[PDB]
Scaffold this active site. Structure first.
Site, PDB file in Angstrom:
ATOM      1  N   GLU A  35      45.178  29.354  28.833  1.00 15.86           N
ATOM      2  CA  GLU A  35      43.772  29.333  29.186  1.00 15.86           C
ATOM      3  C   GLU A  35      43.383  28.149  30.036  1.00 15.86           C
ATOM      4  OE1 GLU A  35      41.535  31.627  28.927  1.00 15.86           O
ATOM      5  OE2 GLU A  35      42.558  32.980  27.537  1.00 15.86           O
ATOM      6  N   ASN A  46      33.175  33.423  36.615  1.00 17.36           N
ATOM      7  CA  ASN A  46      33.491  34.840  36.725  1.00 17.36           C
ATOM      8  C   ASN A  46      32.385  35.444  37.610  1.00 17.36           C
ATOM      9  OD1 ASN A  46      35.700  34.766  34.566  1.00 17.36           O
ATOM     10  ND2 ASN A  46      33.955  34.268  33.277  1.00 17.36           N
ATOM     11  N   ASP A  49      30.460  38.919  36.706  1.00 22.01           N
ATOM     12  CA  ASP A  49      29.369  39.050  35.756  1.00 22.01           C
ATOM     13  C   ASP A  49      28.521  37.802  35.648  1.00 22.01           C
ATOM     14  OD1 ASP A  49      31.661  37.857  34.324  1.00 22.01           O
ATOM     15  OD2 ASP A  49      30.439  38.072  32.527  1.00 22.01           O
ATOM     16  N   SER A  51      29.245  34.756  34.508  1.00 18.63           N
ATOM     17  CA  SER A  51      29.444  33.934  33.313  1.00 18.63           C
ATOM     18  C   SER A  51      30.515  32.899  33.668  1.00 18.63           C
ATOM     19  CB  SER A  51      29.849  34.785  32.104  1.00 18.63           C
ATOM     20  OG  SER A  51      31.176  35.261  32.221  1.00 18.63           O
ATOM     21  N   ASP A  53      33.719  30.241  32.005  1.00 17.09           N
ATOM     22  CA  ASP A  53      34.564  29.899  30.866  1.00 17.09           C
ATOM     23  C   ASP A  53      34.664  28.362  30.859  1.00 17.09           C
ATOM     24  OD1 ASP A  53      35.091  32.641  30.125  1.00 17.09           O
ATOM     25  OD2 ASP A  53      36.593  32.772  31.701  1.00 17.09           O
ATOM     26  N   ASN A  60      33.511  31.501  26.694  1.00 17.60           N
ATOM     27  CA  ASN A  60      32.554  32.185  27.570  1.00 17.60           C
ATOM     28  C   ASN A  60      31.057  31.943  27.317  1.00 17.60           C
ATOM     29  OD1 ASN A  60      31.071  34.967  28.489  1.00 17.60           O
ATOM     30  ND2 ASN A  60      32.777  34.447  29.857  1.00 17.60           N
TER      31      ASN A  60
END
Length: 130
Positions: A35, A46, A49, A51, A53, A60
Site C-alpha cells: 500500500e 483517485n 471518484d 477520494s 488514500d 480512504n
C-alpha cells in the site's frame, strides 16, 4: 517517515495488531508494504471518484477519514485525514482496526487480495523478533 521493515513490525505488535480480528502481523506487514512501502506520508488521489488514500495503510477519505473535499463521504473512524500522515502511527492503526471491524475484514484492500492473500507472507516479519 519511511519505516524499516522490522521497526514497523515491532511497532504494530506493540500496538496490538498481531491477530487483530484474525489478521496475523505478517498480513498487516504485507498490506503496508504494498500500500505504501511503509511510508506514513504516502497519499494517492483517485481521479475517478475524487477520494484520496492516506498514510501507511492508504486509508480512504470516503468512509474512514474526513478531508472535506471528498463527495458523498462520511467519517466512520471519525478522524481527520491529516492524522493519518503523522510519523506516529497510533491513529492510522486505530483507523485500520475500525476498517477490518467490517464484515469484509482484511479483504477491504484490493491490494491485499492481489499480493498477499493465499501466499507465503512469513518473509515480511522474518528476523524481526516478533
Amino acid at each position: 517517515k519511511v519505516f524499516e521493515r522490522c521497526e514497523l513490525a515491532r511497532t504494530l505488535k506493540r500496538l496490538g495488531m498481531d491477530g487483530y480480528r484474525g489478521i496475523s502481523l505478517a498480513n498487516w506487514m504485507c498490506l503496508a508494504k504494498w500500500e505504501s512501502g511503509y511510508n506514513t506520508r504516502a497519499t494517492n488521489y483517485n481521479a475517478g471518484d475524487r477520494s484520496t488514500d492516506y498514510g501507511v495503510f492508504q486509508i480512504n477519505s470516503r468512509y474512514w477519514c474526513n478531508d472535506g473535499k471528498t463527495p458523498g463521504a462520511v467519517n466512520a473512524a471519525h478522524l481527520s485525514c491529516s492524522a493519518l500522515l503523522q510519523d506516529n502511527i497510533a491513529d492510522a492503526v486505530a483507523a485500520a482496526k475500525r476498517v477490518v471491524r467490517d464484515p469484509q475484514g482484511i479483504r477491504a484492500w484490493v491490494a491485499w487480495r492481489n499480493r498477499c492473500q493465499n501466499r507465503d507472507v512469513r518473509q515480511y516479519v522474518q528476523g524481526c523478533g516478533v
